[PDB]
Amino acid sequence: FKVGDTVVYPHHGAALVEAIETRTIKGEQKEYLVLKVAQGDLTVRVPAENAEYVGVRD
């Protein structure tokens, strides 16, 4: 996943990814993909390593 590419996050559906954040937790900087769905009005933030596990897909 890259910034600016629309992605499908279930069960909500379509959403637009804003950027990749490297905020540190437990002293490790994580690829925090942040993604927004207008209808849900919810900032979905997930590490990129486990993106497929949660099921987010293009």
Partner: protein, 49 residues
């Protein structure tokens, strides 16, 4: 301990109607309150705002 929910950012909008109008029309002189949430998950990992 599989998830948690948190609150922050207490914001107040402008009052819906002015003082005299609210007094006249039986309306309570209030303003909407908006608070941002954060629904963190632990089993998989994601925060919802």
């Amino acid at each position: 301990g599989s998830m948690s929910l948190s609150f922050s950012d207490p914001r107040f909008d402008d009052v819906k109607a002015p003082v005299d109008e609210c007094k006249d029309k039986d309306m309570t002189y209030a303003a909407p309150l908006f608070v941002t949430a954060e629904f963190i998950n632990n089993n998989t990992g994601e925060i919802k705002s």
